[PDB]
């Protein structure tokens, strides 16, 4: 229910022992990919969508809509983490990745239960969900490993921070609140994933790890902005 | 707009003269509409009403419901064809065939607001996926005109229930959406039952007032426990 | 307050001693009765007067004027038990009749502490509740003893069963809130009437009893519907 | 609309130039009116108007109250009548006959909405009754004056009352029809203001304010103990 | 910020050890003036200022702008204290003075640091409260000691009448709500300051005073008036 | 009550007469300054002053006392601008500092006659605001003409951006909308500014503009996160 695709502290072995969740240092890869975007994510706030959820009268066929659109999101991404363990040629992202992987089929309990969605075939995805989709796979099965780790961050930190912004906007007793709920708090798996990719940071071209941050990013904004066009 | 009316443009052939008219007091669809009533006032009951009513439904239950109502409109769908395949006469043939198509239109929306391709991508809950298997069983298994018996519950139960919650559900309330949607005529049910009638020497009563009962009573099941998550 | 006009189990003497409460059989003439009438329960569920105490916003005006007149009925109720004890066919229902008759003197209290009313004569009632009042009275007067359970059975049995629908439809801080703690409940006024009806089951026509019991529940209509035309 | 005034058409006869403007400042109106400002104050505190003003009033305290307002309005009627009867001065003799008369049209609001027939067939409480016997008292045992001082409390205080709460109550709120019902221009009460100015020097004032201080007071013991139920 | 000029019992010393907070004797000449401007105070009440104060819908806008007014308004006062202590020719009533001066001081701390404003002379005071102060410099400055007493009344005792008026009226959960706790409770300055007059009531015309009194009386209605109109 | 210190039609005279109030082009100054402080802005949204004034519950003595400070702080502006003027490095940007004056000028006029503030002296402001307004005047009369354009940017946009960002989290109903009415629309006077700095871009150090900005930028934020602490 807690939206979080972190690996927990049980799973944190073999190479993942030492792996930490501390909010990575200011001059990390995290950071400077994350404030790039920000003008973005102050868009992701102005949409419909999250007017409606600060508000509580985000129309509960939007919210739906979108959460089938995000059931095929995450059992596509479970897929290409899958995929990133298999191309990956260094054994602590093999295991990362694997460890990823399972926090999403965790994760995913809630779309096959609660949302009765068996799998991605199963859905019509729209457009923009889906282009975000196959950009995602791409990286996954085309492009170096750490880079896998750059495209999956926004969906982990942007949600989280959207949470945290719009907390002292959404009331307690609103119909939304739980939004906040769910999805607020201390973005764990987000500083977690950082701090793997920032021991690759070496290994990769960072504007093109920009390049591709900033297109995830636009995604979710794109996402959210069709979500409450019904 | 839910209605899987046959509309005025598809009553072709033996169709033509098929109405939409209230079902006369004797007509076998008030028996059976009457004696499952308790029943309906019990749909009114749940959680799930008491929340559309008050605008606080939790989203999560209404879309969760939603979805394994389009697995039940899918299947709805392939029944009524599986029905018009296997039909009696022709009249039945052309009705069902109508009423298939009626869902088709509607079932549109399931496809593109809600993103559901097909029922095998869905994993049904315990009590819509008996309910279905109910009514496949009716369109397979019984004679044709039980086929308008088992599915005239839910063509009427929702828009009673939407015109009985429409003056306890503020205009400017989340959910006032479901009354503007569900209600209103229930033309779809009155022109379905009217063909019903027509039938209604070829079958027997006591069997259709029991398969009309175990439908609705299937509603109740299906909505007592969308809210339970 | 609570409106109730069963007998209490201090009152369960003599011919009385063994009158239960409880549910009645689902093959009860009881069950009967209300089955046939439900159509009619549900189109005071769909009354101005239900819709307003479920939203807090009915007249005070509409609720106050409808409550004088529930006075004269009860008023003329009690008497109505009165006289069915002076024809009664046997002891049992003399008894029966005559304890009745005390319970509505006991809740009449109300009308005369708290809405300051003195007796039936110093109240001009409405055409509907005159009308069904004087139906009451002519059961009473006029047909046979168990006949005088069937008609009396609606008021005993709808209110609580209005209530208890309404419940989950009537926040707890609504001003009308109370309608729903003073008549909802178990209704085991109804319940013990609908025990005595059913030994005498066979001493009536179900059809008359039927016809009687419609006329009544067709007054509670009737008299919901015209309270809020003011 | 509450209103006791003598409409224009029955101001007849000797009644013809009665006014309805506002009395003079240095009338007896305001004299008994201006010592009393307290009590009507004290009125104001009353959980009654703090009910009225918030929308949250029992509507069983409300209704309570206006049965004992119908007990209290059907004797004020015969009070003027036994005023009119006890008059030897032409001109209030017709001034309480037409009085009788303005308060017999208010009172069918209470015959035909409320449903009660008379007095004698309600119960009154404790300060109802005491306050309707006072003024039963002053109409039949005191000078002719004397009945317009006892009798303006009740003319006055409800629409000063709702002229005062009406900024301090909601338009769409639950008692708002109160204001609209009782508030405007107080014609009746300064109609009979006009009236007693004439006999102010054929009465003691002093009595007159100790009169019409026991009314005032009156009515906030009415309205105090009108919501403890 | 809780609104009294009461002088505190640490600073009853000298001449004014005995002072008394009580409230006045019914035939004392606090009450006497109170009692003649009821009908100024109930207007007071029928102002939009207050009535935005209960419904917790006065224009913020309105409430700062007044509140900067009573600042000029409250060091203007102080300074009229002092004049009048200087003007006494009668001892206690130089140490009442003084010492209301401090109270005003103490008070006036709230318009130097929650406020920003430094001296009246920085403010630009609508007619009204411009005009209300004169009338109380003239009244310091210019006539016998113990009116001073009877001018500054008003303010003194309006406020907490009024807050202990409206408190019923005004949710405990409403913006300006904070109005009724700093304003209400028992009138102790007021008390303290009708008992010092009263000793002084002899020595003054009371007609003169009714006149004094009955001036600030409609100043501040006028002020209250004017407050809304921007 | 409009919040603009644009320079209107009728006083684009002179050497102003071709001055545009049109978007900046993306390649400007004027963007570079402001996406470089898209951090603290959105911070300043996550002030309590500005989630007060989207739930309507800001404290009414928070909001008052700030604009008091904020009558400080235009009136001080008012006086850099004559300054900047009378400095001038050449007869156009002369002309532009007399003509924004005369903006604030006519903008004053809410805090003489509203809020009835009669000159900065008068007031005694706090810390923060202090600090920001030494800071301008300190930019005004020491460094290069231009320079004033950018260190007057932040108050002119942040406002308006701010503004347009909670509009559709600040119900129209709401006590404190009256915020966004006067304070959002079209930035015009921002623009205006904008496009004067564009055409001297070349005659200053970027990197000084950055720093100039980001301080003002961090001086509304100290402000605004100062303001509900009383
Ligand atoms: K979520
Ligand atoms: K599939
Ligand atoms: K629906
Ligand atoms: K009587
Ligand atoms: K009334
Ligand atoms: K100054
Ligand atoms: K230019």
């Given at each position: 229910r807690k939206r979080t695709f972190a690996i927990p502290a049980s799973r944190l072995?073999?190479?993942?022992?030492?792996?930490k969740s501390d909010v990575p240092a200011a001059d990390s890869l995290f950071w400077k990919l994350w404030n790039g975007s920000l003008d973005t994510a102050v868009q992701v706030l102005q949409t419909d969508y999250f007017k409606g959820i600060a508000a509580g009268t985000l129309d509960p066929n939007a919210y739906g809509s979108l959460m089938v659109q995000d059931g095929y999101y995450c059992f596509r991404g479970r897929d290409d983490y899958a995929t990133a363990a298999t191309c990956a040629q260094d054994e602590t992202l093999r295991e990362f990745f694997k460890a990823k992987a399972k926090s999403y089929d965790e994760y995913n309990e809630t779309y096959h239960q609660t949302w009765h969605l068996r799998e991605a075939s199963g859905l019509i995805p729209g457009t923009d969900i889906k282009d975000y989709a196959d950009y995602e796979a791409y990286v996954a099965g085309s492009?170096?490993?750490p880079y896998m780790c750059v495209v999956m961050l926004p969906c982990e930190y942007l949600w989280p921070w959207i949470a945290n912004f719009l907390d002292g906007y959404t009331?307690?007793?609103?119909?939304?609140?739980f939004w906040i709920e769910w999805?607020?708090?201390?973005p764990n798996g987000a500083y977690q994933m950082g701090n793997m990719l920032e021991q690759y940071?070496?290994?990769?071209?960072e504007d093109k790890a920009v390049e591709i941050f900033n297109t995830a990013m636009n995604y979710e904004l794109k996402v959210f902005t069709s979500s409450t066009i019904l």
């Open positions: 072995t073999g190479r993942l022992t030492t792996l492009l170096a490993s009331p307690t007793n609103s119909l939304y609140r999805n607020g708090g201390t940071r070496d290994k990769i071209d």
